[PDB]
RNA sequence: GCUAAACCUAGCCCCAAACCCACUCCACCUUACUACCACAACCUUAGCCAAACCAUUUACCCAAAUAAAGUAUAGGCGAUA
RNA sequence: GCUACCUAAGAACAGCUAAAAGAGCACACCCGUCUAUGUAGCAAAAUAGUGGGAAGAUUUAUAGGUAGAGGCGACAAACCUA
RNA sequence: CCUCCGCAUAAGCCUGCGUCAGAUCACUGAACUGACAAUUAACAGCCCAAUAUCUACAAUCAACCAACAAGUCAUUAUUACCCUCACUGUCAACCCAACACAGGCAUGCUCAUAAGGAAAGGUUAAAAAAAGUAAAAGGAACUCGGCAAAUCUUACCCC
């Protein structure tokens, strides 16, 4: 029996809890004709391409927003291929699953025939990001290992169950987006699109207006830990034999209008109680607030295109292994 | 092999456990791919007043004198609502056996938002 | 706020709380229509406080401070509901002359007994309703004998009751 | 409101309302350690989480973020002198996560 | 070995000896009627 | 012999109560007490209409009552159509002559060693292995999983040549786009409704392959005919339709030109997958449809021989076998068989790899064949790249 | 000296008299006790048993107690009716 | 709801030899040859060992059907709630 | 020291070794009585506007080959169509066999365990009884019969 960790979550204040499970310190901040191609993809989905069957408001995220994000990634990567030779050779996946399975902490079974025995907590995270870019050579770290930070890991008083989280038993999976035999094992960038259930106007409908940023943050931490976690395992590292270099990846999370950016460094897989006992080393996640790409779209133009948001997409793509 | 216990949604196989419920009044419908559509209008809205500057409290002073219990009937309601208007209009020639609707009577309940029979409101 | 699920902290665990008398039906009839509606929420909040207080005593394995309060509150609201009900009922008589708010009919079930069948609301008319037409609102002949036996049974029980009444009076005469 | 016939709705109908609501609530101390925002309630069976949200924010002005329910089964094990089962009644449990922290 | 002839299921129990099964035929109706006259508390499964 | 046995049909309603016949009186029915009883007569109810509209419970008009209903029958060719005669039928309808093999212009593109990508063979084999083995968690991926992913990766691979060729910056590939194109052949009304993703969109139209001399030479050739098969077989025969020529885009769309149509057969079952001949037919009609739609947009609704032809090309695949088509629409006057004919170059049954082993074959504890693709040939990728690099 | 023993009253039976209950709110013929969507009922009782077997046959409520009278009559003219 | 038979929609069968099969050896599974124990027993038919089949006329979960003047039956007068 | 068992789902059951207080093969206690707690949906159940119209080509790594018993899975046209996450299952040592019964019991993962368990209340070393291990010389002489233990053979006959 393992907990099923959902990257995209409706749990209140789920960022705090996810930090506990992954032993992650969250840090605020980071460690041309592209505008033309960017806005053209927006206009393609929203306006230019005409729809036989009328678009329902529940279906809009899957039929408008999702193919847009498909399009933007594929164009930008091709266009920036002359700038960055890594992205030329890089493999990109559409809706490929990513799995990670780790153990953190212990419990004593409260009831039953096994009551009062020691058991460990298992956590399984299964995620299907909209887009991801894989590379043959690892990206360079942001900060070294043993990079001490004066910020404490959040601790949860009660059971992990009290945040709505549920135990189920199935196949334990480690997976980077492809099997082991594929040479492109290392991770560049992930693009996520939030479900229509976790939309901001719905979250304004419930009193939880302060949780919009939690959703973005929670998605990043979990999915990135999972992705880097998995990559480290493909290099033979695990709980007992911890990592000898940092493993880094970066993520772009959107709702189709608002964009967030995150960088993750995995420093440790020593999460098991025995391994964790004496280890000051921590995983680090950087991130920033969601910013609107565009104010609105009326007919044939986008109002108030914010360029800096588009460039932050460029700056992430421009990162190359040294 | 039990007959005497109350039958509940806890009790059947998988399909059975889905179908039955407790007493709760449903608030929408289901569509393709088991998507639940909520209707805002099907959801009861609590019509709750303003309580500021309100003198009445939930208990009563014992100092209050006792009075004889007399329930409400249609006869006395007519006497203290409609009857004074009728008799006042009987003094002059304004009263009429036709178009007595002026006194508050209605021929039909069909148009009304709050229909008395059959009742169409909650409490 | 959430705080008003509990009473004034000053009277927490006081063994005794001095409380007023329950509202009378007469008192509530004098009260306005709108004012009854307002009073009714005042009584609502009060009930919930006392109900949570009941449960907390039960948990701590302690006696409640003044348990009779709950009874008073309940009675008041019973009274209020009755008063309001009366007004609606009166108005129905004056407007439609219908004694019952919900429509229904005397019907004959399959067990051959007479029932007051209450109607439900439907979108479609009755002849088109498959589920409704499944119901049998009549008794076939085989039922009549059972009706006989049932009647006979009722009579027996009654006869037995009568006898015992008489017998009891007799012994009560010999002793006095 | 409970134990009353709810009037049917057809498209473009009037908004359904209650004026006096049969539902009565207890706020109860949880038996298990909880998050600080979470509060527990015993609730009528026929009540929904939608209803409880509206109930709390309507009457008590309590801003709520999240509500989850479950149906607790009372034991039918106990027996009397006549060897007949005594049923402890089933009740509904609502957990409410408050908003604004 | 015998004795475990009863291999229980809710679906089968209800479809064989339920209220709806009872009322379905006139014979079954009379079965209900009998139990009502005797004063059974379980009229059917 | 009529179909549908008597028992299965809805039972004939029981004969009417004899009381109804007698002209003097009206029967006593159980209408009054709102339920059936056996002893009173069966009432006859007036037909019922729900006064208000409810979306979930909606009944459509009879077919004559629809506004778009026409006596003249249009025949629609869509994605799920499967031609009986295959390419033979396709050609007839689109009024075309076929030529075996690709044009010489496109084959000259892969002539120079420069135009070849670095580590071509390594990359292509990696694509096959990623798509067909390494893709998902489970051991043997299914066709609907591997078929689009292999094409996606082959497009990516060609798209890496942006370094060498600046012209590739002037294209996009669009998903879930639709075209409609209508014409006549011997006064049969035909309409192609194109659905499916992977349309290659460019700012510039392709230049014409064939010369005007070639186009004039087509006149002497006669369209091949098949008997007693009608050329309209296996098309959705429709009475309710509207005539519209649509490119699938609003006016002033950047990248409005159809460079290439990519077509997939992501069907797991053999009967669900189209036959090779049938698929080539589908791409001919689709390529034609896309070319004719564009022609109608900027040259109007007149039937004429165009001064400058339109070129569209297409690739159809199952994930393993590839078909490549180049199409040239040079005429719009299609009503008569005789005259100028459209042009089609086709290469078929060009398969990228013969077989694939997900799991190693062991016979008597020794590996007969190791894991991987079997019988790979790169010349088919060259052709794929050749069609991509056309117009760049 | 243990185990025990002892009890009078719950109630019930047969009569007479008299023609009986069908019931706040909610739910209940679908898997009853589940708010909310296009078929239909009337149709000879048989048998045990008696006849010392068994085969035709063998009392069963029909609308005033008594008497007519176990009479007329019926019946393997016998049991019996 | 056992069992006999059927109907609908499923599920299971490792390893080794085989010209490749209602094949052979042999798990799980299904059955029950022979022996001993047990005989108010662990058990109103079991246990230990030894055996028969184990890709098929195979085994098995779920739902439905056939009813006693009868059903069902690779006929044993077999089975239809010990 | 043992493990052909375990963990999970389903099916079945219905609070049936959580806490606290009294109380009684074994504790003067607990799998007894009473009082108090608990199982939170993302898993699973619970679905779908209409009328026509479409649907020849198995599965087996589907490729080559090879069949026979011939096979689980597709639409299009037009009309109608804009609101959102409600309700229910979620515990345990547990079910069918009158029992805390050497019996019965579907699927997935682990094929020997990281999980789960304990054959001996204390002693003595009688007979008879059950299950083993070894046995000089002999090797069926036993017996209805090589039944059983062994050992791990050959040629036939009847059906
Ligand atoms: Mg069975
Ligand atoms: Mg005799
Ligand atoms: Mg005799
Ligand atoms: Mg058989
Ligand atoms: Mg065999
Ligand atoms: Mg064998
Ligand atoms: Mg025989
Ligand atoms: Mg015989
Ligand atoms: Mg729930
Ligand atoms: Mg779900
Ligand atoms: Mg252990
Ligand atoms: Mg022991
Ligand atoms: Mg002993
Ligand atoms: Mg001895
Ligand atoms: Mg010897
Ligand atoms: Mg001898
Ligand atoms: Mg001898
Ligand atoms: Mg032997």
Dihedral in degrees, nearest 10, Cα atoms A286, A289, A290, A291: -120
Name the structure determination technique: cryo-EM
| HEC per residue, chain A | CEEEECCCCCCCCHHHHHHHHHCEEEEEECCCCHHHHHHHHHHHHHHHECCCCCCCCCCHHHHHHHHHHHHHHHHHHHHCCCCCHHHHHCEEEECCCEEEEEEEEEEECCCCCCCCCEEEEEEEEEECCCEEEEECCCCCCCCCCCCCCCCCCCCCCCCCCCCCCCEECCCCCCECCCCCCCCCCEEEEEEEECCHHHCHHHHHHCCCCCCHHHHHHHHHHHHHHHHHHHHHHCCCCCCCCCCCCCEEEEEEEECCCEEEEEEEEECCCCCCHHHHCCCCCCEEEEECCCEECCCEECCCCEECCCHHHHHHHHHHHCCCCC
Residue D3 region by backbone torsions, left for phi larger than 0, else alpha for psi between -120 and 50, else beta: left
The protein footprint on chain I, as nucleotides within 7 A of a CB, is 7-18, 33-59, 61-63, 73-93, 95-98, 103-104, 108, 115-117
Helices (H) and strands (E) in chain B, counts: 3, 3
- Give the DSSP H/E element, type plus range, for residue D38: strand D38-43
Contact residues, chain A, for D100 at CB < 8 Å: 207, 210
| HEC per residue, chain F | CCCCCCCCCCCCCCCCCHHHCCCCCCCCECCCCCCCCCCCECCCCCCCCCCCCCCCCCCCCCCCCCCCEEEEEEEEECCCCCCCCCHHHHHHHHCEEEEECCCHHHHHHHCCCCCCCCCHHHHHHHHHHHHHCCCCCCCCCCHHHHHHHHHHHHHHHHHHHHCCCHHHHHEEEECCCCEEEEEEECCEEEEEEECCCCEEEECCCCCCCCCHHHHHHHHHCCCCCCCCCCCCCCCEEEEECCCCCECCECCCCCCCEEEEEEEECCCCCCCCCCCHHHHHHHHHHHHHHHHHHHHHHHHCCCCCEEEEEEEEEEEEECCCEEEEEEEEEEECCCCCCCCCCEEEEEEEEEECCCEEECCCEEECCEEEECCEEECCCCHHHHHHHHHHHCCC
Residues of D 9-38 whose CB lies less than 7 Å from any atom of strand G:
9
CA of residue A160 relative to chain centroid, distance: 21
Q: Where are the domains of chain F?
A: 66-392
| HEC per residue, F103-114 | CHHHHHHHCCCC
CB D22 within 8 A of CB D46: no
| Cis-peptide, bond into residue F228, ω within 30° of zero | yes
Residues of F 38-97 whose CB lies less than 7 Å from any atom of strand G:
38-39, 47-50, 54, 56-57, 59
CA of C43 to the centre of ligand 15 (A): 103
CA distance A201 to F196: 33
CA distance C140 to F221: 86
CA distance C174 to C163: 17
CA of residue E13 relative to chain centroid, distance: 8
Contact residues, chain C, for D94 at CB < 8 Å: none
CB D96 within 8 A of CB D66: yes
Nearest to F291 by CA among F79, F92, F94, F88: F94
CA distance from start to end of chain C: 67
Q: How far is CA F113 from CA F116, F148, F167, in A?
A: 6, 29, 19
Beta bridge partners of F356: F373
Nearest CA in chain A to D38: A162
CB F305 within 8 A of CB F331: yes
How crowded is residue F166: how many other Cβ atoms within 10 Å of its Cβ? 10
CB A270 within 8 A of CB A279: yes
Q: What is the CA radius of gyration of chain F?
A: 29
Burial class (CB in 10 A: 0-12, 13-18, 19+), B107: exposed
Residues in chain D: 101
Q: Which nucleotide is nearest to E11 (CA to C1')?
A: G31
SS3 content of chain E, % helix, strand, coil (to 5): 60, 0, 40
CA distance A245 to A142: 11
**CATH assignment at residue D55:** 3.30.70.330
CA distance B45 to C17: 35
Report DSSP state, residue D57. I
CA distance A288 to A79: 26
**CATH assignment at residue E30:** 1.10.287.3980
Helix, coil or strand: residue B45: strand
CA distance C96 to C157: 42
- Give the DSSP H/E element, type plus range, for residue D67: strand D64-72
The protein footprint on chain G, as nucleotides within 7 A of a CB, is 10-18, 20-41
CA distance F357 to C150: 81
Q: Protein C145 CA to nucleic acid G73 C1', in Å?
A: 39
CB D92 within 8 A of CB D45: yes
Kind of pairing, strands F96-100 and F342-351?
parallel
Signed CA dihedral, F294, F299, F300, F301: sign only? negative
CB A282 within 8 A of CB A153: yes
CA of F59 to the centre of ligand 17 (A): 100
CA distance F76 to F182: 9
Q: How far is CA F82 from CA D29, F79, F199, F241, F379, in A?
A: 69, 8, 21, 21, 29
- Which residue segment(s) compose the domain that D49 sits in? 1-101
CA of C14 to the centre of ligand 3 (A): 92
Nearest to A47 by CA among A64, A59, A30: A64
E8 touches chain B (CB under 8 A): yes
Residue F269 region by backbone torsions, left for phi larger than 0, else alpha for psi between -120 and 50, else beta: beta
CB A266 within 8 A of CB A234: no
Beta bridge partners of A262: A251, A287
Neighbours of chain D (3+ CB pairs under 8 A): A, B, C, F
Extended strands (E) in chain B: 28-31, 35-38, 45-46
Full DSSP string of C147-174: HHHHHHHHHHHHHHHHHHHHHHHHHHHH
CA distance F150 to F10: 52
Signed CA dihedral, A78, A82, A88, A93: sign only? negative
Contact residues, chain A, for F149 at CB < 8 Å: 94
Cβ contacts of residue C115 below 8 Å, gap of 6+? C106, C107, C108, C109
- Give the count of domains, chain A: 1
Q: Which nucleotide is nearest to A168 (CA to C1')?
A: I43
Kind of pairing, strands F305-317 and F257-264?
parallel
Extended strands (E) in chain C: 104-108, 114-118
CB A259 within 8 A of CB A8: no
Kind of pairing, strands A186-193 and A247-254?
parallel
Cβ contacts of residue F35 below 8 Å, gap of 6+? C107, C126, C133, C135, C137, C138
CA distance B58 to A31: 62
| Per-residue exposure over A263-287, b if at least 16 CB sit within 10 Å of its own CB, e if not | bbbbbbbbbbeebeeeeebbbbbbb
Q: Which nucleotide is nearest to F58 (CA to C1')?
A: I49
CB F190 within 8 A of CB F298: no
CA distance C41 to A100: 53
Helix, coil or strand: residue B23: coil
- Give the count of domains, chain D: 1
CA distance C79 to C71: 12
Helix, coil or strand: residue C108: strand
Instruction: State how far residue D81 is from chain C, nearest Cα, in angstroms.
Output: 25
- Give the count of domains, chain E: 1
- Which residue segment(s) compose the domain that E13 sits in? 3-45
């Amino acid at each position: 029996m393992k907990y099923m960790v959902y990257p995209q979550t409706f749990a209140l204040n789920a960022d705090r809890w996810y930090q506990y499970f992954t032993k992650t310190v969250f840090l605020s901040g980071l460690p041309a004709a592209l505008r033309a191609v960017a806005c053209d993809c927006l206009l393609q989905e929203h306006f230019y391409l005409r729809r036989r069957r009328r678009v329902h408001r529940y279906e809009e995220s899957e039929v408008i927003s999702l193919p847009f994000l498909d399009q933007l990634v594929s164009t930008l990567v091709g266009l920036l291929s002359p700038h960055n030779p890594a992205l030329a050779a890089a493999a990109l996946d559409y809706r490929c699953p990513v799995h990670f399975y780790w153990v953190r902490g212990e419990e004593i079974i409260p009831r039953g025939h096994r009551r009062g025995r020691i058991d460990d907590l298992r956590y399984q995270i299964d995620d299907k990001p909209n887009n991801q870019i894989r590379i043959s050579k690892q990206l360079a770290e942001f900060v070294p290992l043993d990079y001490s930070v004066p910020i404490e890991i959040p601790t949860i008083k009660c059971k992990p169950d009290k945040l709505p989280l549920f135990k189920r038993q199935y196949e334990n999976h480690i997976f980077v987006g492809s099997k082991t035999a594929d040479p492109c094992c290392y991770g560049h960038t992930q693009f996520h699109l939030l479900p229509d259930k976790l939309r901001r106007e719905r979250l304004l409908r419930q009193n939880c207006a302060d949780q919009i940023e939690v959703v973005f943050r929670a998605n990043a931490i979990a999915s990135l830990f999972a992705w880097t976690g998995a990559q480290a395992m493909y290099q033979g590292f695990w709980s007992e034999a911890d990592v000898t270099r940092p493993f880094v990846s970066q993520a772009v999370i959107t709702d189709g209008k608002y964009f967030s950016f995150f960088c993750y460094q995995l420093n440790t897989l020593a999460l098991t109680t025995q391994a964790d006992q004496n280890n000051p080393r921590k995983n680090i996640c950087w991130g920033t607030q969601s910013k609107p790409l565009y104010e609105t779209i009326e007919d044939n133009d986008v109002k108030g295109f914010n360029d800096d948001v588009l460039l932050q997409i460029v700056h992430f793509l421009l990162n190359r292994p040294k | 092999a039990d007959r005497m216990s109350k039958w509940t949604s806890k009790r059947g196989p998988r399909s059975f456990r889905g179908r039955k419920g407790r007493g709760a009044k449903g608030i929408g419908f289901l569509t393709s791919g088991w998507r639940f559509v909520q209707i805002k209008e099907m959801v009861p809205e609590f019509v709750v007043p303003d309580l500021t500057g309100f003198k009445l409290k939930p208990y009563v002073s014992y100092l209050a004198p006792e009075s004889e219990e007399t329930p409400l009937t249609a006869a006395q309601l007519f006497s203290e609502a409609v009857a004074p208007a009728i008799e006042k209009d009987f003094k002059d020639g304004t009263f009429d056996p036709d178009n007595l609707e002026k006194y508050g009577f209605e021929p039909t309940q069909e148009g009304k938002l709050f229909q008395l029979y059959p009742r169409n409101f909650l409490r | 706020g959430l705080e008003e699920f509990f009473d004034d902290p000053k009277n927490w665990g006081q063994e005794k709380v001095k409380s007023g008398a329950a509202w009378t039906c007469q008192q509530l009839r004098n009260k306005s229509n709108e004012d009854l509606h307002k009073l009714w929420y005042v009584l609502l909040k009060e009930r919930n406080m006392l109900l949570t207080l009941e449960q907390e005593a039960k948990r701590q394995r302690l006696p409640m401070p003044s348990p009779e309060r709950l009874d008073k509150v309940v009675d008041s609201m019973d009274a209020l509901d009755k008063v309001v009900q009366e007004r609606e009922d009166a108005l129905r008589l004056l407007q439609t002359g219908q004694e019952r708010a919900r429509p229904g009919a005397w019907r004959r079930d399959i067990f051959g007994r007479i029932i007051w069948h209450k109607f439900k609301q439907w979108v479609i008319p009755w002849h088109l309703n498959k589920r409704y037409n499944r119901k049998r609102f009549f008794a076939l002949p085989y039922v009549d004998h059972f009706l006989r036996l049932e009647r006979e049974k009722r009579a027996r029980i009654k006869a037995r009751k009568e006898n015992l009444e008489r017998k009891k009076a007799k012994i009560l005469l010999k002793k006095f | 409101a409970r134990n009353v016939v709810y009037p049917l709705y057809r498209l473009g109908g009037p908004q359904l309302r209650v004026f006096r609501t049969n539902f009565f609530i207890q706020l109860v101390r949880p038996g298990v350690a909880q998050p600080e925002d979470t509060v527990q309630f015993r609730i009528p069976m026929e009540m929904t989480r939608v209803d409880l949200r509206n109930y709390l924010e309507g009457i008590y002005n309590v801003p709520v973020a999240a509500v989850r329910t479950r149906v607790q089964h009372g034991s039918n094990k106990r027996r009397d002198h006549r060897n007949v089962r005594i049923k402890k009644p089933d009740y509904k449990v609502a957990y409410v996560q408050l908003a604004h922290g | 070995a015998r004795g475990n002839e009863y291999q229980p299921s809710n679906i089968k129990r209800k479809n064989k000896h339920g209220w709806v099964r009872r009322l379905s035929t006139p014979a079954g109706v009379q079965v209900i009627l009998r139990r009502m006259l005797k004063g059974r508390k379980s009229l059917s499964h | 012999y009529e179909w549908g046995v008597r028992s299965t049909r809805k039972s004939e309603p029981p004969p009417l109560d004899r009381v109804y016949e007698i002209p003097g009186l009206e029967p006593i029915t159980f209408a009054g007490k709102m339920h059936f009883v056996p002893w009173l007569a069966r009432p006859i109810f007036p037909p019922w209409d729900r006064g208000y509209k409810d979306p979930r419970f909606y009944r459509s008009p009879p077919l004559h009552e629809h506004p778009l209903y026409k006596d003249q029958a249009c025949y629609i060719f869509h994605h799920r159509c499967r031609l009986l005669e295959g390419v033979k039928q396709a050609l007839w309808l689109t009024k075309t002559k076929l030529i075996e093999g690709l044009p010489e212009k496109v084959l000259s593109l892969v002539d120079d060693p420069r135009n070849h990508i670095e580590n071509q063979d390594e990359c292509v084999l990696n694509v096959i292995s990623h798509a067909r083995l390494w893709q998902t968690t489970e051991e043997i991926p299914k066709r609907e999983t591997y078929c689009p992913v292999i094409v996606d990766n082959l497009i990516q691979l060609c798209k890496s040549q942006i370094l060498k060729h600046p012209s590739l910056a002037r294209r996009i590939c669009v998903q879930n786009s639709t075209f409609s194109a209508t014409w006549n052949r011997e006064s049969l009304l035909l309409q192609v409704r194109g659905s499916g993703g992977a349309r290659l969109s460019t700012k510039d139209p392709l230049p014409t392959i064939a010369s005007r001399e070639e186009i004039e030479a087509t006149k002497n050739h006669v369209l091949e005919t098949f008997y007693p098969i009608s050329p309209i077989i296996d098309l959705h025969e429709c009475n309710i339709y509207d005539v519209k020529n649509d490119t699938g885009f609003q006016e002033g769309y950047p990248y409005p030109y159809p460079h290439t149509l990519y077509l997939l057969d992501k069907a797991n079952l053999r009967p669900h997958r189209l036959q090779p001949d049938q698929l080539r037919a589908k791409m001919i009609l689709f390529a034609f449809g896309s070319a004719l739609a564009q022609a109608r947009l900027l040259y109007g609704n007149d039937a004429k021989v165009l001064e400058q032809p339109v070129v569209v090309q297409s690739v159809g695949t199952d994930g393993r076998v590839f078909h490549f088509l180049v199409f040239q629409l040079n005429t719009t006057d299609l009503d008569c068989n005789e005259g100028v004919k459209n042009l089609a170059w086709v290469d078929s049954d060009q398969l990228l790899y013969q077989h694939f082993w997900c799991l190693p074959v062991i016979k008597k504890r020794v590996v007969v064949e190791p894991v991987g693709p079997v019988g790979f040939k790169p010349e088919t990728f060259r052709k794929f790249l050749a069609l991509y690099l056309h117009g760049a």
